[model samples]
Target: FVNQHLCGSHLVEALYLVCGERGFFYTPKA
Candidate 1:
């Protein structure tokens, strides 16, 4: 469920660094 140019890329990394939890990537809640 990852994209080559999306997950962990610039935007994801940015949001992850700024708002996400320590051991998780960026995603939505259920």
Candidate 2:
């Protein structure tokens, strides 16, 4: 469940702030 694709990545941050763990869909770049 991607909150927002590459294009809307910026918006993902805002969503993540509220969703927390559930919004953790991005893979670590490491």
Candidate 3:
């Protein structure tokens, strides 16, 4: 996933650290 989809995304590593999978939603700035 990260190798193609989120290879250079914002929450790339962070996503892995938190969710550990490609099943999350972004809660943009407020």
Candidate 4:
């Protein structure tokens, strides 16, 4: 999923921090 589609740029860093480099490996469905 695109960051713009999710919680936006604000949550991007947090998401990446939590998920790490592997974050982009999978697409989340919500």
| lDDT comparison, 1 vs 2, better candidate | 2
Worst 10 residues of 3 by lDDT: 1-10
Cα lDDT of model 1 by residue, 1-30, tens digit: 234455437766766656656645556554
On residues 1-30, what C-alpha lDDT tens digit does candidate 4 reach at each position? 434545556466667777886775334564
State which candidate, 2 or 4, has the greater lDDT.
Answer: 2
For model 2, the run of ten residues with the poorest summed lDDT: 1-10
By TM-score, how accurate is candidate 4? Answer: 0.36
RMSD of each: 7.4, 5.3, 6.9, 6.9
- The lDDT for every candidate, in the order shown, is 0.56, 0.62, 0.56, 0.60
Off by over 4 Å in 4: 1-7, 24-30
Residue 1, candidate 3: Cα error in Å is: 21
Clashing pairs in 2: none
Lowest summed lDDT window (length 10), candidate 4: 1-10
Return the TM-score for each candidate structure.
Answer: 0.36, 0.31, 0.29, 0.36
Give Cα distance to truth, residue 5, candidate 4, Å.
17
TM-score of 2: 0.31
User: Per-residue lDDT for 1-30 in model 2, tens only?
Assistant: 455463366656666877887756665453
